[PDB]
Amino acid sequence: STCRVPVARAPGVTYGKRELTVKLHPDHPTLLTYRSLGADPRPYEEWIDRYVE
Amino acid sequence: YEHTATIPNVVGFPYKAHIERNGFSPMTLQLEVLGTSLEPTLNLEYITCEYKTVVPSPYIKCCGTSECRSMERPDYQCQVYTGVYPFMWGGAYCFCDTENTQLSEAYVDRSDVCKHDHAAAYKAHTAAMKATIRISYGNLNQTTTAFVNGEHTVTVGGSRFTFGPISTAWTPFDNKIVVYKNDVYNQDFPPYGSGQPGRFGDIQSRTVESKDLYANTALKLSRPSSGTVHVPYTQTPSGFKYWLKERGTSLNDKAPFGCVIKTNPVRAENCAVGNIPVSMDIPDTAFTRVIDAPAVTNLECQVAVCTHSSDFGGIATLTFKTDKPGKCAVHSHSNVATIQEAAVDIKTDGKITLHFSTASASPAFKVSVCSAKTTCTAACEPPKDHIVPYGASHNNQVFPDMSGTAMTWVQRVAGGLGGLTLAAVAVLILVTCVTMRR
Numbered sequence A: 001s002t003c004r005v006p007v008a009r010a011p012g013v014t015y016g017k018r019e020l021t022v023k024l025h026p027d028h029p030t031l032l033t034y035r036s037l038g039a040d041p042r043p044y045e046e047w048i049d050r051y052v053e
Numbered sequence B: 001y002e003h004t005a006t007i008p009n010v011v012g013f014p015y016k017a018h019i020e021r022n023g024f025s026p027m028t029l030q031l032e033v034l035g036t037s038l039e040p041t042l043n044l045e046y047i048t049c050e051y052k053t054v055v056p057s058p059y060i061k062c063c064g065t066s067e068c069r070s071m072e073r074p075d076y077q078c079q080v081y082t083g084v085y086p087f088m089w090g091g092a093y094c095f096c097d098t099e100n101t102q103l104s105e106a107y108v109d110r111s112d113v114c115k116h117d118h119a120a121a122y123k124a125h126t127a128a129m130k131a132t133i134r135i136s137y138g139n140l141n142q143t144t145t146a147f148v149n150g151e152h153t154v155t156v157g158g159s160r161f162t163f164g165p166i167s168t169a170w171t172p173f174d175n176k177i178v179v180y181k182n183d184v185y186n187q188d189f190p191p192y193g194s195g196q197p198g199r200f201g202d203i204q205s206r207t208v209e210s211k212d213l214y215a216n217t218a219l220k221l222s223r224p225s226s227g228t229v230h231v232p233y234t235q236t237p238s239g240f241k242y243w244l245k246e247r248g249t250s251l252n253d254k255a256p257f258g259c260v261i262k263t264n265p266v267r268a269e270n271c272a273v274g275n276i277p278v279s280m281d282i283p284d285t286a287f288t289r290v291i292d293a294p295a296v297t298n299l300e301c302q303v304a305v306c307t308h309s310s311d312f313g314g315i316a317t318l319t320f321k322t323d324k325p326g327k328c329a330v331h332s333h334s335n336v337a338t339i340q341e342a343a344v345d346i347k348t349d350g351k352i353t354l355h356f357s358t359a360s361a362s363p364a365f366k367v368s369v370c371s372a373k374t375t376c377t378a379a380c381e382p383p384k385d386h387i388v389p390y391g392a393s394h395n396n397q398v399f400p401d402m403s404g405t406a407m408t409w410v411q412r413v414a415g416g417l418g419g420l421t422l423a424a425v426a427v428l429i430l431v432t433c434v435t436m437r438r
């Protein structure tokens, strides 16, 4: 079966000099994930429940 | 025509391979990677899923006695209990107060939806790479798919193309692979027949159509309470559900080189690592003669503006003199910059513009238009955005030109120091010569 799931709002990104800062506004616990595209990735995990930076 | 080239294993980047054929006008070719797939070989070890504890109704031998019977059943338990006095709603089930036995029997069976809900343990080895390549040269523009090894040739407009084997044997999958639906995990699953209760692999089955099932769930049987028919038993919970709610993230979230892991079949796509050697077999029909190709002379290169950004932030103005209009092939013989266009319109005005991408402050790349030669020198600038959503279109060369301002100052300092050192050497040499003279 297929279930309708909510889509989170696009985070607000301010570009720093090889820095990346995002505003996170979740209505509910939301999973944020990123990894590096190079030889040695550094994956991340955190469940976001409030506004964080 | 025999020609070999090496291209990066990057999707969305068009390599420009240039053929200098002797008797014909030069031709520049578009090598575009549309998408790759690293395809490992999977050896299924066993199938793991939730189990099912089947507890039939207990036989209660009213004023009598039975013995336990062994059964060829996985994780089978059979305990007889004497002295039982059960009760029902209407009253006492058996007749004698203490002369009674109850037969407790329980076992583990494959769940009804292992056919649906299960995880497969695999071994991955000998990953086979297959890539999608677009060839567009001259007047043709075609796309074909070929296995990336020195043993596959695909026809492209009469041409024999063979992409020789992946530069590196790197793979994102480990020896042991566990696949659940669309997720792949690098997990050391326990060997077959050595599973522990409460962990992944507590029950193991070789195949979905397997008849033999291994179960190690530490099933235990205990006395029923007085006046109750309930078949007490304490058993370890399923390790499959424990793994499901302790699996975490899959290989898609930790794969290096930006690999995208998919299943059906298990594969890693668009990994950006290594080089793809290319062997080319171009016939005569594709090339053009120099008698019909324009003759380009007096080519100078002057540069108005250049920025060493990820995109083609360099702008090059070329001046030349031709006899007839037509189409030249343009190439950069230096990795410092890469020209965006491979063939431009050649007309009478004798001036053409080019877009190039560089990464160095003072690039020195060389541009050839048809058979002409010239040197392009520029001062590129640090760009505007700290972050862009597209990859770099250059080769990431940051060494400045031998004649750049920084290298100019370095060379001036070195020349002055060397002049002083050679003057001192000459003075000492002359002095020593005079000393041995006297």
Ligand SMILES: CCCCCCCC/C=C\CCCCCCCC(=O)O[C@H](COC(=O)CCCCCCC/C=C/CCCCCCCC)COP(=O)(O)OCC[N+](C)(C)C
Residues within 6 Å of the ligand: B396, B397, B398, B399, B410, B414
């Ligand atoms: C009078 C001063 C003499 C003292 C010099 C002492 C040298 C320093 C020793 C150790 C430094 C450790 C760092 C590694 C070096 C990386 C270089 C490299 O790797 O060069 C690479 C290749 O170069 C060559 O092919 C050789 C050409 C240069 C070598 C000799 C040039 C003659 C003199 C040198 C000028 C520079 C020094 C003087 C300037 C300072 C004056 C104020 C640069 O090409 P690339 O973009 O691929 O590099 C970027 C790396 N990428 C893209 C892979 C990330």
Ligand SMILES: *[C@@H]1O[C@H](CO)[C@@H](O[C@@H]2O[C@H](CO)[C@@H](O)[C@H](O)[C@H]2NC(C)=O)[C@H](O)[C@H]1NC(C)=O
Residues within 6 Å of the ligand: B030, B136, B141
């Ligand atoms: C040869 O053809 C391909 C496939 O049609 C061209 O790719 C298209 O490029 C245009 C822009 O001109 C895009 O709008 C299309 O979406 C692309 N089609 C795809 C990706 O399926 C490609 O530019 C051509 N290359 C040449 C002319 O050398």
Ligand SMILES: CCCCCCCCCCCCCCCCCC(=O)O
Residues within 6 Å of the ligand: B426, B427, B430, B431, B434
């Ligand atoms: C690059 C230019 C080459 C010209 C070299 C010029 C030579 C310098 C002129 C005077 C040199 C004399 C130094 C030797 C010391 C004399 C006293 C002695 O020998 O006892």
Ligand SMILES: CCCCCCCCCCCCCCCC(=O)O
Residues within 6 Å of the ligand: B416, B419, B420, B423, B427, B431
């Ligand atoms: C790099 C500048 C030019 C190179 C020539 C520099 C001249 C240096 C002066 C010469 C040294 C003086 C001569 C006598 C030295 C001695 O024998 O004690």
Ligand SMILES: CCCCCCCCCCCCCCCC(=O)O
Residues within 6 Å of the ligand: B432, B433, B436
């Ligand atoms: C690099 C330091 C010196 C090594 C190279 C030696 C080769 C050159 C020969 C030295 C000069 C010999 C000529 C006689 C003059 C003298 O005795 O000083």
Ligand SMILES: *[C@@H]1O[C@H](CO)[C@@H](O)[C@H](O)[C@H]1NC(C)=O
Residues within 6 Å of the ligand: B011, B012, B034, B035, B036, B037, B269, B270
């Ligand atoms: C990734 O892979 C598929 C097939 O290998 C390809 O069609 C797709 O365009 C690729 N995505 C990217 C990064 O362009």
